[model samples]
Target: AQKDEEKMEIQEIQLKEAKHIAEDADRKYEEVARKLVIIESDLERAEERAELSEGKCAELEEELKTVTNNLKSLEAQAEKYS
Candidate 1:
């Protein structure tokens, strides 16, 4: 009777508090998940830039080597002629 009703009401109150905490946990989880996604995106872009920069540096190094080799060869030829 009254005892059973009180017990039932107490159970219901616990259920409500549990539900509130669960929802709060879910909200925080979603926020962190979104933040991680953004960080991953930025990390990927930075990696791409790093790769592109490495490629450009190699290209310029090769071009410089070619020009220097040509200059040395020309200087040798001029010396031989002189």
Candidate 2:
């Protein structure tokens, strides 16, 4: 009957619309996942650089201590002569 045909037409449109929504959701999920991968990698790199900086700072501190000790010893020897 004509009424059955009209029902079928409406049902078909609804089905297509639902499919499109699902496809859109899937696309958004994929985009977010890709973005997160890049962000995570950058975070890891930053952490590695920070660790390197800390190691360098420790080395500089050790060098500073050695220089200070040398200066103190030299000053003491000069004071003995004066």
Candidate 3:
């Protein structure tokens, strides 16, 4: 009977320790998940900004080409007049 009580007492302590460990793990898991969400959101925002920058750069390039062509044509006309 004494041995049985000792065994029961040990098992109870083990159960409490396991519960605490599980709770700690769960808390850590939640923290990591929140951090991951924030990181993903920031990454997406960066990607969106990069895409916008690329589009703007392409637009500027086209405008530059058009202006360069116009300048060349004007130069040719000036040479002809001279």
Q: All candidates' TM-scores?
A: 0.71, 0.80, 0.82
- What is the TM-score of candidate 1? 0.71
Task: Look at candidate 2 and tell me the lDDT of residue 11.
Answer: 100
Candidate 2 ranges with C-alpha deviation above 4 Å: none
**Residue by residue across 1-82, what tens digits does model 3's lDDT show?**
9999999999999999999999999999999999999999999999999999999999999999999999999999999999
lDDT of 1 by residue, 1-82 (tens): 9999999999999999999999999999999999999999999999999999999999999999999999999999999999
How much is the lDDT of residue 13 in candidate 3?
100
On TM-score, the candidate that comes out on top is 3
Error of 1 at 51 (Å): 1.0
Compared with the true structure, the alpha-carbon lDDT of candidate 2 equals: 1.00
Error of 1 at 53 (Å): 0.3
Task: Please provide, for model 2 over 1-82, each residue's C-alpha lDDT reduced to its tens digit, 9 standing for 90 to 100.
Answer: 9999999999999999999999999999999999999999999999999999999999999999999999999999999989
- Quote model 2's TM-score: 0.80
Model 1 lDDT, residue 28, Cα? 100
For model 3, name the residue pairs that clash: none
Q: Rate residue 79 of model 3 by lDDT.
A: 100
Error of 2 at 79 (Å): 3.8
- Cα lDDT of all candidates, in order? 1.00, 1.00, 1.00
Task: Quote the lDDT for 68 in model 3.
Answer: 100
- Against the true structure, candidate 3 reaches a TM-score of 0.82
